[PDB]
Structures are given as C-alpha cells and as structure tokens.
Write a protein that binds this ligand. Structure first.
Ligand SMILES: [Mg+2]
Ligand SMILES: [Zn+2]
Ligand SMILES: [Zn+2]
Ligand SMILES: [Zn+2]
Lengths: 45, 61, 263, 56, 48, 147, 67, 49, 113, 57
RNA sequence: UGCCUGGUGUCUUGGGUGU
C-alpha cells in the first residue's frame, strides 16, 4: 500500500504490513520510505 | 512471503546476479578475510589462488 | 539649479557627479536606489521532485537570489494589491526548471539558463533570467549525477529590498565627497605625518588642493558628490537612477497628499 | 513481480495471454509448462531485470 | 464538526497570497493555518 | 558589552545560515509470548489515552512520510500496546478499547520537514524505525558568534 | 558547499564565475590575476571566490539513494 | 559466551570500568560518546587524556 | 519565532494613519508630526530641506527605536507662517529639485549614449 | 551575591527572543551580553505587585 | 445530523553554558 526503497540497490517495492522487512531482490535489511505525494512549497527566502 | 522464501529468492537472484557494486565490494572483503585466514595458516598454495582471484576482480575506476 | 555630470556610462554601472544639491538629497537618493526600487524575483518554489544532494530549501534560497529582468515591472502589480483569487498573469511570473542527467557516468551542471518562462504579463519584458551574453550559461544552481533529477516550478513576484535583499537592483553604491578634506569633516589619524600616511582619493585630481596659506572656510558646505551605481543586471544603471528619483518623488507626493487631505 | 514464486510455475500453467509472434500480429498461446534455463539470463523489462524463467 | 480541519488549504488574498497550509484550529470565522513555507502558524478569516 | 551588529542584507544572502537535523528512534518491544507492540495509526475508538497532537499526518503503517512539514506535538510515529479488554463487550459494537497509545510526538519547541524515514529490524527481529527531521536556522538577535 | 549566488557583503553576483575562475587557474594564471580578469575589484567579492571550498564534489561521490 | 560479551559491552556502553554488579567504586567516565559536532572536535576528543 | 514580518516595515495597517499631527504647546507655533512606516530616507531629506527656510526656526527628528519603522519630527516656524504650510512648501520644493535632476540626467545620458 | 541582583523592572513587549536591558543595570547584575541568561518572575497579586513596585524597583 | 482527546518515568552518569 505504501512504497519503499532499498538501501543498497535502490529498488522500489511495497509491503503489506505483514511481509518481513527486506528488499525483495538483494535481501537488504534496511529500507526507506518514499517521498510524499503532497505539494511542497517554499518561500525562497 | 516467509523469511525462508525470501532467502531462497535472494540466493536465486544472486545466482542470476551478474554484477553489483555493493555485492562486488562484499565479495572482495570476504576474499580478503579468507586470504588473511590462509596466511595465518601458512598455506602458500591457497593464498596464490586467492591473490589471483582478487587481482582479477579488482582494478576499479 | 541641480546639475549632473556623467563620467563613465555602461549597461551595468554609471559613474556620475552630482552638484548643487544638499548632502541629504544625495544620501536619500543612494538609500532609495539601494533598498526601495522595485524589481522582480522568485518568491515561491513548488518542488515536484528533488533527488539532488542539496536540500530543498537550500535550492529554494539559491533560486530566490537569481536576478530576473525587471524592465517593465512598473506595469506589474503587487501580489497583495491584486484582487484576483490565487495568482494571475498580471501579478506573477511563472518559471519552470527541469534538469536530469542521462548515462551512468559524468556530472551534469544545472544553470540558470535552464529556467524557462511559462506564463507572465502580456507583452511585458519581465521574468527572463538575466544573461550576460547569448552564450552565457548563467548562475550555477546545482549539480547532478546519474538518476538524480530536479523538477520545480517557481513563481516570481514584485517587491523591494526592504522586505528581502533578493529584490535589490544595486550591488554596491560607491559614494564620496570632498576628496581634499577642505570642510574638515574628518580628522586624520596618523603616527608621524597625516599627509603622507593616507592614500589620495581617486577623485583627488578633480578638485584643487588647498593652498598652503589658505585659512579655514567656515561658510562652506559639501557641494559636489561622486557616486558610482552598480547593478546586478536586472535593471540598467540609468533605469536604476531614474526609478530611484521617481520613487523618491512618489514618496514625497504621498506625504503631501496626506497633509492636504488631513484638514 | 511474481515469476520467482515457487507456486508461479503452477499459477502460469494453463493461462491465456497476449503474445508477440514476431514473425507483428499478437496472438494467444496456451502454457504447457515452464522450464528454468541456466545461462539464458535475459533483460525482462530493464537492464537489471535479469530472468532465467522460461515459458513453454 | 469542522469538516475543513486537517485539510490542505491555499490563501488567495492578503499578505500570504498563494501559500499552502494546513488548518489547525476551526473555532469560527478565524482559522489557524500553519504555513509550509516558514515555520509559523497564522490566523486567517474563512473568506481568505 | 560583547554584543555585535550584523548586516541584515548579508543574512538574507546566506551569511552564517545553517542546517539542523534531529533523529527520533522507536522500536516494537516484546513483553511475552504474544504481547507485542504494533506500528499503526491508532483510532479514537479502539485506543484510549491518545496524545493531544494530531495523527492525520501518519500513513497506513503508522510512520510519517518524508517531505511532510511537521510542527510541535505532532505525531511522527504511531505505536500501540495491547491491553486486556474490559467488560465493554457487554453492548459495545466492537468499539471497545483493546490497545493503549504509545506514540512518539515531535518535540514541542521544534518544527521542520521530515527528511528521511528508515525502517528495519533490530537484533531481536522486531520492527525498528528512525525518523530524521530537517530545518534551517537563520541568524537572529541572540545567536552566539566568536572569532 | 557550492559557490554562493551573491556576495554576502555588497551583493554582486559571483555565482556565474566559478567555472571561469577554475579555467583561468588551469591556464597557469595566478589567483590575484584570475580574480582581476573576472572584474572583481572589491575585496569583499574577492574573498567569496578566493576562500570558497567546493564540497558538493564530495557529496556527489556517494551513490544516489534512488533510481 | 554471554559472560565476556555482556561484560565488555556494558563497560564500553556505560563507561564504568568494571563488573556490572560492582558499579560503585569502579572508575567511571572511561568510555564517552564521540563528539561529532565538527571535525576538529572529533579529532580533539580522540586525543584526550 | 518572535521575528516580525518584513513587510511591516513599509505596509501600513488600515487603522494606523500615515501621518498624525499634534501641537506642541510649550512653545508658540510648534507642531509634532508622527510619520508611520518611514525612516531616515524621508526624514533627513525633509529636515535638511526645511532647515534652510528663513521662516523655520526649529526642525528636528528622531527614530525612537530601530526595531520600529516610524519617526517623529518637531517643527516650529515664525509667527506669520503656519508650520504645515512650511512642510508642504518643503515637499513641493524637493519634488521640483528631483524633477529637474531627472531631466538633466536624461539629457546627459542621451548625450553620452 | 547581593540584594541588587534581584530588582523589579517595568515590562515593555518587544519582538525577537531576548530580554533587553538598559546598559547601566549590567553592573549590579554583573551581566554582559556574551551569552548570559536571566530569570523573570511575575507577581500574581495586587499586594505583591505593590511590594515589587514600592520596594525592589 | 454524525460528531472531538490533554496524560507523562525514575535513578545514575557524562559532556557542556554563565558567572
Ligand atoms: Mg558573560
Ligand atoms: Zn535491495
Ligand atoms: Zn493577480
Ligand atoms: Zn562584494
């Protein structure tokens, strides 16, 4: 439901809150969430 | 998927894995550790093969 | 009664001499040119994707400082004074940047030339980032390697340098008067001799040095002012000078109107 | 996304899918089975998408 | 029950035109909106 | 008396401007054979004693996503611990509190942008998250400088 | 980290002169002569290019986190 | 194997140079968190007596 | 956190008058003028222009605090002249000076273009 | 150290995040502006306000 | 008419700030 990114091979995937925390293709134990889809605005100051 | 299934898939893709910088670095580190183990055992025959393999794998840019 | 004499003229800097004006008027003109002439600068950044090594607000701050052509900014309106919902074409200029590196080797530089004007006021010469020449790449904004992309949409608004220094058209205004210190407005620190320990002013040849037997003149006032106006390229030097004069006139006229309407 | 599953071999069995004939009129083929082929790694979708599974 | 609470909003008038925020307080006719651009929260009328 | 005057225009152009990062850690503890903590977005119905902050910035897995602006007292990690149910099963339509909130709020005086969220497993095989927050600090009256 | 867009003190745009400065230094010109050739008169501007340390070339050597 | 492992880890983690159950009367502060505020601070911390 | 908005230096609130005048009864024919959202740029110009008028016997100004954008000016003329008329004359005279300065600069720039 | 280290001032609300003092009172407090911090206590009654304004001013 | 929440460990230790 929510995307994730591996910490070594930078491979995108998704998890269902029941899979083991692991990259599907290289088996790394550290993964990162992906950026939000909301709008990000800055004041340029 | 289960943990064992994940390990099996990872091993399968490693067999399919032609090359990956992280995996190459890990392999070179493991080879260096094996080489020091052979050196401490005074095995002059294994160390030559490990040195040849390390020379072949190396030479990065 | 006031007089102007131009020494050097360029697109980016003018060196001129004012005379027959009070020191206060020249200083007010300098202050107005420094911090009260309206220009156009990026004020909102909407970051659709930023995978570079720089922080989002780092790049936003860098973008805000890029000078944009502000020739016709008089016709433009202030954002807070525009009745339109959201931003229209008459109070904002929309620029878009999209940078990407292709291939698995090398580094790509993102320059201000990549900023593309998408929308703005009709037929007004505003919004385009300033370029020295047609082949000048411009200000370096960021650097990218493989699989790093920068995709942003920036909105430029009209403002003055009082609110933020990014709207200042001038860089540094050299200002100087009385090179030979005949008015004794400064007292010269020295160790042995004050005359040979202090460098001559660059305009020392424009005024006759005082005679050895001359007495002090207590009736004299500063009369000739030498000032150099340097710009960032958003506005030409003559445009900066003329618009500073016009801004000062508008301020005084507003004060006069307030006085006359007070009764 | 699912070719490396152990059950994928029986899952793909009997399925009907659009196939590029190449010799292009797309047509439907019936899966009689699958056979892993070592040394025949091929790009599946991108360069990194190496695959050894084959569909008979 | 204040349906606009915790919803992304944009300001169309005043000194903050075109700034994205999130509504935090919805007592009435005076909405507290935190701004994404600086790190601050400001009051604002509903009409804005 | 050791003060100093700084140029506002130089500050506007980036003088002495800096970047600030703070990281938060949390992990799922194991209390027994089947008493575990869970990363989730707690609901006002099934959990009791919630923090006064807002939970609307959490994702489905109870973790905030990078790029989201956060303020003080906002909830960046959603965690619940199980509690033995009461006699509310009398007439409650499944709306009885079985879990207690153990969420991690952002510090009251701090705010910024969520920079990077890390999810992994600890030595014991339980979930383990780290959230890094980023903000920019501009010089102002009272900041300390030295030669 | 990367060359500032404007000089801190006065506000001259120095962000477009880093590449030219490096090119001039490559040809054997001295630092003072290189800064003079770029028309940087005031020493407030000269310190911006003279004392800049380019750290982004070190941050870029890390493998990008996405692809 | 837990004896040596836990003893070393505890002494390095807390800085109390001794057995865990003899925390009192043991020399404290031997192990400290590395100061990473700036490069010079780290270099100074690594050469401290 | 407590830093005020930068536009408050020049943007005038609706309820705040730009220009408030109150008499100074300690001396005859004197007024105190409070300018809002202004600084030394207008104040010094007005002060040095008014100081040269023979019918103005006292003119001064001060900025109470650098963190607030306003200044207060004290003006005191002769018996014949009302101070507000002197202020208006100063404003008009400076406007004419600026106008002729602009004209001369344009002429010189065109000549040297 | 002495009783001039606690004195009662009159509040003036100002922007930015620092307490501000006239520099003549930096001597009794033994304070300078290189990073010192000072404590402020608010009276909560009419009696206490009168005591502060009539004794410790 | 579907209707809104304040409640925050302890003990040690270590490094710092201003005198
Ligand atoms: Mg001190
Ligand atoms: Zn991976
Ligand atoms: Zn508009
Ligand atoms: Zn400079």
């Amino acid at each position: 439901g929510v995307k994730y990114t591996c910490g070594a091979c930078a491979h995108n995937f998704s998890l269902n809150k029941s899979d083991p925390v692991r990259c599907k293709e290289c088996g790394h134990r550290v993964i990162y969430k992906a950026r939000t889809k909301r709008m990000i605005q800055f004041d340029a100051r | 998927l289960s943990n064992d299934e994940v390990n099996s898939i990872v091993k399968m893709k490693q067999s399919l894995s032609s090359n990956t910088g992280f995996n190459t670095v890990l392999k070179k580190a493991q080879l260096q550790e094996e080489l020091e183990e052979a050196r401490d055992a005074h095995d002059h025959e294994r160390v030559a093969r490990i040195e040849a393999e390390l020379k072949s794998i190396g030479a990065e840019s | 009664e006031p007089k102007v004499n131009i020494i050097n003229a360029q697109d980016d800097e003018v060196e001129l001499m004012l005379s027959d004006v009070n020191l206060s008027l020249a200083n007010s003109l300098r202050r107005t040119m420094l911090a009260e002439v309206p220009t156009l600068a990026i004020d909102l950044v909407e970051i659709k994707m930023n995978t570079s090594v720089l922080a989002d607000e780092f790049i936003s701050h860098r973008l805000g400082l890029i000078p944009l052509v502000s020739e016709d900014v008089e016709e433009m309106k202030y954002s807070r004074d525009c009745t339109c919902e959201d931003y229209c074409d008459e109070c904002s200029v929309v620029l878009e940047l999209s940078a990407r590196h292709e291939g698995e080797e090398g580094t790509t530089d993102v320059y201000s030339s990549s900023l593309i004007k998408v929308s703005g006021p009709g037929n007004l010469n505003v919004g385009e980032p300033v370029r020295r020449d047609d082949y000048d790449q411009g200000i370096l904004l960021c650097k990218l390697r493989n699989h790093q992309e920068l995709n942003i949409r920036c909105i430029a608004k009209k403002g003055i340098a009082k609110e933020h220094a990014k709207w200042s058209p001038c860089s540094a205004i050299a200002f100087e008067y009385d090179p030979h210190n005949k008015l004794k407005h400064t007292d010269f620190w020295f160790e042995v001799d004050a005359k040979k320990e202090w460098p001559d002013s660059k305009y020392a040849t424009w005024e006759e040095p005082p005679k050895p037997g001359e007495v002090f003149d207590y009736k004299a006032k500063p009369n000739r002012f030498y000032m150099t106006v340097e710009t960032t390229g958003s506005l030409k030097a003559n445009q900066v000078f003329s618009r500073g004069i016009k801004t000062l006139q508008e301020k005084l006229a507003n004060v006069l109107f307030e006085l006359e309407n007070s009764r | 996304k699912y070719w490396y599953y152990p059950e994928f071999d029986d899952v793909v069995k009997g399925m009907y899918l659009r196939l590029n004939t190449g010799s292009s009129p797309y047509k439907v083929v019936e899966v009689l089975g699958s056979q892993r082929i070592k040394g025949s790694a091929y790009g599946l979708n991108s360069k990194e998408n190496n695959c050894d599974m084959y569909l008979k | 029950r204040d349906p606009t609470l915790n919803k992304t909003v944009k300001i169309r008038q005043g000194g903050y035109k075109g700034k994205i925020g999130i509504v935090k307080e919805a007592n009435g006719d005076r909405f507290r909106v935190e701004l994404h651009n600086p790190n601050k929260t400001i009051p604002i009328p509903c009409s804005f | 008396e050791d003060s100093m005057i700084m140029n506002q225009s130089s500050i506007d152009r980036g003088l002495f401007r800096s970047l600030f990062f703070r990281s938060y850690m949390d992990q799922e503890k194991r209390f027994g054979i089947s008493i575990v903590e869970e990363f989730e977005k707690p609901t006002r119905a099934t959990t009791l004693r919630l923090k006064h902050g807002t939970y609307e910035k959490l994702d489905e897995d109870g973790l905030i996503a990078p790029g989201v602006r956060v303020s003080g007292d906002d909830i960046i990690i959603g965690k619940t611990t199980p509690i033995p149910p009461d006699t509310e099963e009398l007439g409650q339509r499944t709306k009885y509190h079985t879990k207690r909130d153990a969420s991690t709020p952002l510090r009251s005086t701090e705010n910024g942008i969520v920079d990077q969220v890390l999810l992994t497993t600890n030595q014991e095989g339980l979930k383990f998250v780290k959230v890094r927050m980023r903000t920019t600090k501009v010089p102002q009256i009272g900041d300390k400088f030295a030669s | 980290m990367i060359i500032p867009v404007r000089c801190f003190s006065c506000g001259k745009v120095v962000g477009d002169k880093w590449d030219a400065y490096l090119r001039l230094l490559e040809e054997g010109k001295q630092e003072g002569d290189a800064l003079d050739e770029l028309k940087l008169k005031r020493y407030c501007c000269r310190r911006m290019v003279l004392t800049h340390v380019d750290l982004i070339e070190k941050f870029l050597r890390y493998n990008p986190l996405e692809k | 194997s837990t004896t040596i492992t836990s003893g070393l880890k505890y002494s390095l983690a807390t800085g109390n140079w001794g057995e865990q159950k003899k925390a009192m009367s043991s020399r404290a502060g031997v192990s400290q968190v590395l100061n990473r505020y700036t490069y010079s601070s780290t270099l100074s911390h690594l050469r401290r007596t | 956190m407590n830093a005020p908005d930068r536009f408050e230096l020049f943007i005038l609130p609706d309820d705040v008058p730009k220009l408030k005048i109150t008499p100074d009864s300690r001396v005859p024919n004197c007024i105190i003028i409070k300018f809002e959202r202004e600084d030394h740029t207008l104040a010094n110009l007005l002060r040095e222009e008014l100081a040269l008028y023979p019918d103005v016997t006292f003119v001064a100004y001060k900025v109470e605090h650098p963190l607030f954008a306003n200044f207060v000016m004290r003006l005191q003329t002769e018996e014949g002249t009302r101070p507000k008329q002197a202020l208006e004359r100063a404003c008009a005279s400076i406007i004419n000076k600026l106008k002729t300065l602009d004209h001369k600069f344009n002429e010189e720039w065109n000549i040297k273009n | 150290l002495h009783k001039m280290s606690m004195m009662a001032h009159r509040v003036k609300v100002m922007p930015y995040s620092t307490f501000r003092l006239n520099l003549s009172v930096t001597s009794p407090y033994n304070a300078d502006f290189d990073g010192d911090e000072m404590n402020l206590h608010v009276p909560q009654s009419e009696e206490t306000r009168a005591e502060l304004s009539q004794l410790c001013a």
